[PDB]
Amino acid sequence: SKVESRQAAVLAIATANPPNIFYQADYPDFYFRVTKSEHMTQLKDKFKRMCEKSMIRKRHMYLTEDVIKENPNIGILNAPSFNARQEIMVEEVPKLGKEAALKAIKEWGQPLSKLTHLIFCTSSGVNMPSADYHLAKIMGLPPYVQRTMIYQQGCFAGATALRLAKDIAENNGGHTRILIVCVELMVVCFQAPSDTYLDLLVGNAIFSDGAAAAIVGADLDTTTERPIFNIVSANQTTIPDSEDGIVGHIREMGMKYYLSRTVPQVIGNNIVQCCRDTFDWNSMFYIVHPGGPAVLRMMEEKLGLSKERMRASWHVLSEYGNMQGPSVLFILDEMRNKSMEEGKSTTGEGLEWGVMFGFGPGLTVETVVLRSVAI
Amino acid sequence: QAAVLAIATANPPNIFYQADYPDFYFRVTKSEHMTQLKDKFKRMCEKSMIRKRHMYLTEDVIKENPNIGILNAPSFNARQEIMVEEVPKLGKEAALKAIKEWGQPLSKLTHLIFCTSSGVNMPSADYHLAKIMGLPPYVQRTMIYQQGCFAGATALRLAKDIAENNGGHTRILIVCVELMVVCFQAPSDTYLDLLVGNAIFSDGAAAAIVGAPIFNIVSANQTTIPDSEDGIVGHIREMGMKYYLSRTVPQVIGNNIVQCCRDTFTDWNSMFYIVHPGGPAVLRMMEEKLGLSKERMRASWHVLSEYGNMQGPSVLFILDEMRNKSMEEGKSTTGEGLEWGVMFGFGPGLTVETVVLRSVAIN
Numbered sequence: 001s002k003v004e005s006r007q008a009a010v011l012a013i014a015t016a017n018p019p020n021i022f023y024q025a026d027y028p029d030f031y032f033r034v035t036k037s038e039h040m041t042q043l044k045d046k047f048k049r050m051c052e053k054s055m056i057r058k059r060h061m062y063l064t065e066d067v068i069k070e071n072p073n074i075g076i077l078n079a080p081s082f083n084a085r086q087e088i089m090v091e092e093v094p095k096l097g098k099e100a101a102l103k104a105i106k107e108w109g110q111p112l113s114k115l116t117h118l119i120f121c122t123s124s125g126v127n128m129p130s131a132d133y134h135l136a137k138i139m140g141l142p143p144y145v146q147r148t149m150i151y152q153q154g155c156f157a158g159a160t161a162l163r164l165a166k167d168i169a170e171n172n173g174g175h176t177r178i179l180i181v182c183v184e185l186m187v188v189c190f191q192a193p194s195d196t197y198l199d200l201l202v203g204n205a206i207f208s209d210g211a212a213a214a215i216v217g218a219d220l221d222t223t224t225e226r227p228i229f230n231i232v233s234a235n236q237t238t239i240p241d242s243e244d245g246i247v248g249h250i251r252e253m254g255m256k257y258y259l260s261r262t263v264p265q266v267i268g269n270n271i272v273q274c275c276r277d278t279f280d281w282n283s284m285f286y287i288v289h290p291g292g293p294a295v296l297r298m299m300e301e302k303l304g305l306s307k308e309r310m311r312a313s314w315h316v317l318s319e320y321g322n323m324q325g326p327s328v329l330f331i332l333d334e335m336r337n338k339s340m341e342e343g344k345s346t347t348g349e350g351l352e353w354g355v356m357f358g359f360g361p362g363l364t365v366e367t368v369v370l371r372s373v374a375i
Numbered sequence: 376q377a378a379v380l381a382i383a384t385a386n387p388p389n390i391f392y393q394a395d396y397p398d399f400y401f402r403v404t405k406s407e408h409m410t411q412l413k414d415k416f417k418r419m420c421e422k423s424m425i426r427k428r429h430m431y432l433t434e435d436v437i438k439e440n441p442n443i444g445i446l447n448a449p450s451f452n453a454r455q456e457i458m459v460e461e462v463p464k465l466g467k468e469a470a471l472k473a474i475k476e477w478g479q480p481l482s483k484l485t486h487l488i489f490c491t492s493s494g495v496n497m498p499s500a501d502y503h504l505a506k507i508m509g510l511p512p513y514v515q516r517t518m519i520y521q522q523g524c525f526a527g528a529t530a531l532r533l534a535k536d537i538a539e540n541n542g543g544h545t546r547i548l549i550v551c552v553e554l555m556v557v558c559f560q561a562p563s564d565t566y567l568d569l570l571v572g573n574a575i576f577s578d579g580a581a582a583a584i585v586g587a588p589i590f591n592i593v594s595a596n597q598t599t600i601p602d603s604e605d606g607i608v609g610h611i612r613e614m615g616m617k618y619y620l621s622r623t624v625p626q627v628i629g630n631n632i633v634q635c636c637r638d639t640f641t642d643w644n645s646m647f648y649i650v651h652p653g654g655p656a657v658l659r660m661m662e663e664k665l666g667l668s669k670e671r672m673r674a675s676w677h678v679l680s681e682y683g684n685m686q687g688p689s690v691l692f693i694l695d696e697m698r699n700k701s702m703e704e705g706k707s708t709t710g711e712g713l714e715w716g717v718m719f720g721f722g723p724g725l726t727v728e729t730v731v732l733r734s735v736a737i738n
């Protein structure tokens with residue numbers, strides 16, 4: 001189609017995670033032990049129950065027990081540890097982003113010199129110059145790669161990078177190729193347990209580390225690049241009077257995340273709306289940010305979805321946890337790879353139209369209308 | 376094609392005349408016995424070409440938050456709590472004035488781009504602005520955090536592609552705010568980088584509306600200068616932001632943007648210029664390498680004189696001053712009677728944002 005030819009497409013996807021794996025079944029014992037809080041028995045039971053119903057099987061994490069032993073204020077509640085967290089993240093966030101971006105560029109199959117833009121997203125550390133510059137340096141990007149840095153936008157940053165990339169790619173022409181890199185390291189917000197701050201306990205059961213990279217461009221060269229998905233449209237909306245749903249406070253003791261109990265119902269109730277406002281509900285594919293099991297379940301129940309509609313998102317939640325920014329790109333990668341391994345008609349599990357939802361502080365919702373490519 | 380449809384500015388009300396500032400700075404930090412350091416600071420202020428600066432951080436705000444004035448003391452939480460509230464409030468004052476000049480309803484906006492290097496929060500300053508302004512829930516927000524002094528030009532580069540790819544109903548509000556609460560530091564004889572920043576950095580907010588007119592955004596491009604990473608460095612720490620400014624930055628910058636002019640534009644006094652007022656030497660390099668007459672840099676010199684180095688929003692102040700004086704003094708276009716112009720923002724990297732502009736006819 002000429003319609004599909006003129007429009008921004010995703011040309012490659014790849015992911016990376018830190019090497020140390022933490023199985024959720026052992027995490028309550030480890031979490032309450034390295035923070036030296038084993039005497040908070042009632043709290044540990046409450047946290048145990050939290051990890052069991054989190055539908056997370058394993059998480060990858062840079063913050064190991066050895067790194068807590070070298071930066072022990074990170075494991076001591078209210079203690080000054082912001083400088084220690086910053087030093088790690090300013091170094092490690094771009095490195096892990098390089099691991100994922102090298103793989104994405106290998107799939108795209110073009111030289112570094114054909115990149116024109118870089119969009120870097122992270123809520124893990126802040127610096128001047130920022131992680132976008134540091135990524136460009138350690139990858140040897142040319143001086144003409146135009147950088148955009150998306151700091152602290154939480155779990156909708158991956159979706160928002162695609163909204164920006166679509167307008168950049170389409171308005172400057174077929175030369176324009178955007179590299180998107182989203183990285184999260186839970187060094188930023190790890191906090192020791194306390195019965196005063198029950199809103200922080202949930203985050204230590206779900207948040208994890210990972211990096212995803214993608215290439216976006218329009219007007220593709222019909223011999224080197226082929227699209228995995230086309231970005232049809234992308235729109236951000238804000239839920240009125242919900243600012244206290246997800247709150248991140250960056251402090252001398254690191255970041256203090258506050259997660260309201262009602263976020264999954266409010267998000268789930270809103271994204272079901274967006275689906276309807278934007279588009280049989282089993283005839284399209286879905287990428288939902290695995291904020292919690294309750295959001296994915298509400299999609300299924302309120303839209304009457306089969307089990308296979310949400311499978312890629314349940315999957316990334318189980319194998320990686322809540323990685324914030326990059327998570328929707330892990331699910332996009334997981335959907336297309338299984339679609340090809342199982343020989344389905346399209347990269348969207350055999351279907352044509354699809355939606356991607358990111359959401360986070362605000363509450364903010366990013367909705368990306370997608371379309372498969374035939375396999 | 377994308378155009379600037381309105382521009383307005385705001386500043387904190389407290390004025391600090393530069394002639395008084397070495398005395399004030401060393402007094403409120405209880406460092407006046409550091410007499411040789413203070414004489415070095417005096418020479419820096421006296422050569423800055425800054426006449427006055429507007430600043431949120433007054434003596435009273437230091438007294439309320441004493442650790443801001445004690446070198447190395449933990450003051451990050453105190454700084455954060457001021458800025459998360461005060462940055463969007465200052466931005467609101469500028470945005471309301473820009474929407475008023477525009478003449479269209481606030482509800483006709485479709486996008487908000489907020490830029491600041493002063494404070495970080497979730498949700499961020501862009502949400503807080505939308506909240507205190509009552510922007511409708513359909514306004515699509517983008518937050519540009521910690522990009523230094525090229526943030527204002529970078530927002531124009533993004534706004535151009537958003538306005539042009541979405542149609543004619545797309546209207547983007549750009550808001551850039553800086554408060555030096557973020558990086559104010561007490562003097563030390565072993566950290567001379569702070570001495571520079573305390574002589575030049577100041578507070579302000581600017582707002583612009585973009586749609587696809589006062590100027591037309593012909594093109595915009597970012598580039599990075601190799602082997603210059605350590606020229607402008609910002610380290611956000613428990614003591615607040617710790618900046619490091621290389622003495623060679625104005626020469627690396629000035630030689631680069633002089634070269635950007637040459638490569639991009641294909642008589643130098645026949646175009647107009649907006650140069651981020653990083654300091655006097657960058658402006659003097661433009662004048663000297665391009666053989667510019669004295670009126671070319673007048674608007675950039677004027678903003679430096681009357682506001683200091685406000686980082687992100689500075690180029691919009693200069694753009695506003697240029698078109699305002701162009702109208703009042705009876706020039707034939709918004710760019711001082713000239714047709715083509717260029718805006719240069721720059722900051723950590725070193726990163727350069729180049730925006731090719733075009734004026735519109737007035738009387």
Ligand SMILES: CC(C)(COP(=O)(O)OP(=O)(O)OC[C@H]1O[C@@H](n2cnc3c(N)ncnc32)[C@H](O)[C@@H]1OP(=O)(O)O)[C@@H](O)C(=O)NCCC(=O)NCCS
Nearest residue numbers: 046050051053054155198199202259260261263291292293
């Ligand atoms: C494990 C998890 C994923 C699912 O838990 P759940 O089964 O839906 O909730 P349950 O009622 O079954 O029990 C969870 C326990 O943790 C408590 N809890 C759950 N959410 C809480 C919250 N935001 N704040 C404080 N306590 C909370 C509950 O009170 C409950 O305690 P109890 O059963 O011991 O009395 C949970 O961590 C969760 O859902 N968190 C919300 C996810 C979210 O908000 N993501 C934001 C998108 S970035």
Ligand SMILES: CC(C)(COP(=O)(O)OP(=O)(O)OC[C@H]1O[C@@H](n2cnc3c(N)ncnc32)[C@H](O)[C@@H]1OP(=O)(O)O)[C@@H](O)C(=O)NCCC(=O)NCCS
Nearest residue numbers: 415418419422423524567571620621622624625653654655
């Ligand atoms: C401070 C400023 C007034 C420059 O002053 P100047 O024209 O160089 O005047 P001088 O060369 O005589 O130097 C004055 C004093 O300031 C010192 N100084 C100037 N820049 C310095 C720097 N980056 N670091 C440490 N010391 C510096 C000089 O060592 C000198 O000390 P001395 O009087 O004891 O001998 C200001 O215009 C400036 O520094 N601009 C560039 C700063 C920058 O990097 N901006 C980019 C961020 S947007």
